[PDB]
Amino acid sequence: LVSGFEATINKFDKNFSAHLLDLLARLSIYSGMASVISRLDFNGFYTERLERL
């Protein structure tokens, strides 16, 4: 639970974060329509990690 469990958790974490930030950026490019993203992060958690270009 301490070590191998975590070993799976972190690779799942990185993959999910990649698939998540790519999704949010590829949705940010599009211009109610824009109500989605900021609701997905209401707090400003991960408000912006990597600025594209």
Binding site: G32, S35, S38, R39, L40, D41, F42, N43, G44, F45, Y46
Partner: protein, 420 residues
Amino acid sequence: REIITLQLGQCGNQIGFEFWKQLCAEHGISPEGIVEEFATDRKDVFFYQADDEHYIPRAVLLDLEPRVIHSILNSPYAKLYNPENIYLGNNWASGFSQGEKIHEDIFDIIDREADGSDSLEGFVLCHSIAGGTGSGLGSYLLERLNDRYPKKLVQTYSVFPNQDEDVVVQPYNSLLTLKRLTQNADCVVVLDNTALNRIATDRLHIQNPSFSQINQLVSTIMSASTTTLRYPGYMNNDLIGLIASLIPTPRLHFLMTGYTPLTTDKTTVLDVMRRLLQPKNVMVSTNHCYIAILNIIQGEVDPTQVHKSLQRIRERKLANFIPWGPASIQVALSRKSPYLPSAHRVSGLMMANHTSISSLFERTCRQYDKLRKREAFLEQFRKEDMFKDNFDEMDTSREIVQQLIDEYHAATRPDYISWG
């Protein structure tokens, strides 16, 4: 699956009595349990069903040294609540010891209801912290249920007592209750006597009869916290599904309450959310932060505006929280019921995980520590001393609750990824 409510202790039985009466009036139920002639709701979960739609709730009323349970019996609603499951000190140890001798028969009362229902999800305890007879017995029963039903879940509508600090052994009793609750309770919804009394002074001039009126406030919170289950909706059609978001880590499972029209005796969703995030509505008395927030609105709510309301409330940033948790606030909706007044047509409630309650736990721990150094009230009666000669479960509770305090502040820290 149907929920069974294990109301115990004098105070717990008072609030369970009022809660079931509130759901009698709210649902199509008369004081004799008869389906109302004037009467779209999921009454399966909370009330056992007859085909004439008679609805007795799955209440387990536990009495110890009964005084107010006789008054409960001499009521118009005695015919409403009859699972015929009432089976006959102010110290936690006395309550625990008194519970131990009758544990088998009360547990057979539990078993009968579990068998009777088609199925069982949860045990909802109207528990009283440091409640004399209520505490100790509730802790022992809490320890028994998880062992007997490992898959099943226990929620506790703990009325945490703060009365500006009569019982002299309150910190001792409460400290023990929190140890049992921290390790043996899946969820806890905390309420505060001072917080509700301050709200009482705010909304009304009532000061002296605080307990009698505050029952109504507690009942409104309890009913509103379950309305999304009691009425069909899109999401959160089950208790565990609702609970998951509210409790992100097992240790930090204590939940904050709030209600937008505290004077519920038209307002848009933007307004009710903004009102809701203010502290005067909050019914609970170094940086600090929420871990997660959830809000349920019942009324004439226009649907296109609820997203826009969340967007606006994001611009407002009335609620400040940077926890380890990624949980964002969510706007949920439930159905306002017919037959009761629709005053303040739109009315909402919030359940949240907040680090501030660590302060309240630390206040009773502070009282306990001072009292422990003095040893002014060690109790050490024939019951207290014989049950606990070592008096070391008190220290075990102190270290467990101190772990809880440290865990709360670690959740505030940026690095709760590491052990808390």
